[PDB]
């Protein structure tokens, strides 16, 4: 039979059968209970709208993501999300399909063990396998080397790989991602008068960020230009009218990636953690990693980031090496495409964690040889 | 009695006309607004295309 | 110990052709076909239908003017 | 007498209302057609662009 390539993610759940080009169903991972009282009788009001249904009734819900930073903080809601994904968005019972979840690097063990225990006890799948979210993004590019920066919505991690041999001592995981950029944008919009507070209006700020923000090639020059002319002010129409005008908030929101001091984080930007991740590698594979830097994940879709990052790394790196940044147009679904490719391989067909194996060793089987 | 009958019938006919006109107005309004949103969307995507051209 | 992947045979970077070159031409041609058929179905039919509705609207205007004038003529007392 | 006075009065209101409705209907329809024609002119701009793109 065919395998189910699910990809929990944090912000958008992407799923679909193995062997295709794009995920079949992509929908936000939010579960929102209603918060008001409700007076109409017999309206058929449910107790929790999940997935894309709660992005249409969000006016009277309190949306809450079940995955904070890679890790899962609310297991009941995550179980509800998985149940919805299997039964309503794909309509395939899990009793007859292997599953291939994905997990960020350096995550707590208990999260992974609970994930496999749920998949084997509640949904009762035949066999499931957990894979690191960066190796798949490297599969999708058709490479076999390269250092991949997978800046998702929950957590940004940077896994270097050479000739198929991952370097476990050079993984640099940073917890700045799309959600923190949304919060920072929502916080700097208040400088013009627009106040978004409700958890429903966070979605509106996210839409503003997606449609308007861009990464500046040079930050100081843009700050000077936006403060003199008015060629940058782009307007946007809220879900009820009252258009708003975003000035130099456009390139200040995604600039947080390269200067995490804006949101008070100490660490260095995504332009310098990649160079540090390279320098921890051996001295003989640094040229190949320099030449095959891969971008993935949703948050790396800002217009103009593949040039800013290249300029920064070229500034840091030695002058002789060639710096090349692979930015495929299908960046958002790169991890899932790689997952489909991996699940479609014949050599991989014996790596699944078969159910009888789980019955013999318990949930701690995932840390064992079947990784 | 005769005047009453004629007046009532004229009234009822005009009333039903009123209701049907309102319904027609509503439907044409929905279609026109959908066209308006379509136009705004096409213009906005056109401008995005222009800015994409500016990029590259 | 870290997992040990059993040794296989092949391949990689050879499916990039079979997943890229396909849509490099088929997708472009199919989208061009879709745009052509949608424009043909939509624009000319919409303009013709709007002209037809405009003519019907003008006829309704004439009927309204005639009825209003005759009723105002009779009722004027 | 009360009945027929009422009926004629409300009928006159109905006639004036319905005529106002007809003016509204015509204005809305004509504006819709004008907007749709602007949209189709934009579509033929895009179609000239597509004929250029026939370069591919
Ligand atoms: N076109 C875009 N431009 C800018 N940011 C985007 C765009 N699309 C998605 N994002 C950001 O990326 C996030 C989605 O990232 P995603 O790759 O789905 O995360 P995950 O790894 O959990 O799947 C969204 O929250 C949004 O903030
Ligand atoms: Mg991801």
UniProtKB/Swiss-Prot annotation, chain A:
<dbReference type="GO" id="GO:0045202">
    <property type="term" value="C:synapse"/>
</dbReference>
<dbReference type="GO" id="GO:0031032">
    <property type="term" value="P:actomyosin structure organization"/>
</dbReference>
<dbReference type="InterPro" id="IPR004001">
    <property type="entry name" value="Actin_CS"/>
</dbReference>
<dbReference type="GO" id="GO:0005884">
    <property type="term" value="C:actin filament"/>
</dbReference>
<dbReference type="InterPro" id="IPR004000">
    <property type="entry name" value="Actin"/>
</dbReference>
<dbReference type="GO" id="GO:0033275">
    <property type="term" value="P:actin-myosin filament sliding"/>
</dbReference>
<dbReference type="GO" id="GO:0045471">
    <property type="term" value="P:response to ethanol"/>
</dbReference>
<dbReference type="GO" id="GO:0055003">
    <property type="term" value="P:cardiac myofibril assembly"/>
</dbReference>
<keyword id="KW-0963">Cytoplasm</keyword>
<dbReference type="Pfam" id="PF00022">
    <property type="entry name" value="Actin"/>
</dbReference>
<dbReference type="GO" id="GO:0090131">
    <property type="term" value="P:mesenchyme migration"/>
</dbReference>
<dbReference type="GO" id="GO:0098978">
    <property type="term" value="C:glutamatergic synapse"/>
</dbReference>
<keyword id="KW-0547">Nucleotide-binding</keyword>
<keyword id="KW-0206">Cytoskeleton</keyword>
<feature type="modified residue" description="Methionine (R)-sulfoxide">
    <location>
        <position position="40"/>
    </location>
</feature>
Curated annotation (Swiss-Prot), chains B, D:
<comment type="subunit">
    <text>Homodimer. Heterodimer of an alpha (TPM1, TPM3 or TPM4) and a beta (TPM2) chain. Interacts with HRG (via the HRR domain); the interaction contributes to the antiangiogenic properties of the histidine/proline-rich region (HRR) of HRG. Interacts (via N-terminus) with LMOD2 (via N-terminus) and TMOD1 (via N-terminus).</text>
</comment>
<feature type="modified residue" description="Phosphoserine">
    <location>
        <position position="55"/>
    </location>
</feature>
<feature type="modified residue" description="Phosphoserine">
    <location>
        <position position="43"/>
    </location>
</feature>
<feature type="modified residue" description="Phosphoserine">
    <location>
        <position position="24"/>
    </location>
</feature>
<comment type="similarity">
    <text>Belongs to the tropomyosin family.</text>
</comment>
<feature type="modified residue" description="Phosphotyrosine">
    <location>
        <position position="33"/>
    </location>
</feature>
<protein>
    <recommendedName>
        <fullName>Tropomyosin alpha-1 chain</fullName>
    </recommendedName>
</protein>
<comment type="function">
    <text>Binds to actin filaments in muscle and non-muscle cells. Plays a central role, in association with the troponin complex, in the calcium dependent regulation of vertebrate striated muscle contraction. Smooth muscle contraction is regulated by interaction with caldesmon. In non-muscle cells is implicated in stabilizing cytoskeleton actin filaments.</text>
</comment>
Curated annotation (Swiss-Prot), chain C:
<comment type="function">
    <text>Troponin T is the tropomyosin-binding subunit of troponin, the thin filament regulatory complex which confers calcium-sensitivity to striated muscle actomyosin ATPase activity.</text>
</comment>
<protein>
    <recommendedName>
        <fullName>Troponin T, cardiac muscle</fullName>
    </recommendedName>
</protein>
<comment type="similarity">
    <text>Belongs to the troponin T family.</text>
</comment>
<feature type="compositionally biased region" description="Basic and acidic residues">
    <location>
        <begin position="38"/>
        <end position="77"/>
    </location>
</feature>
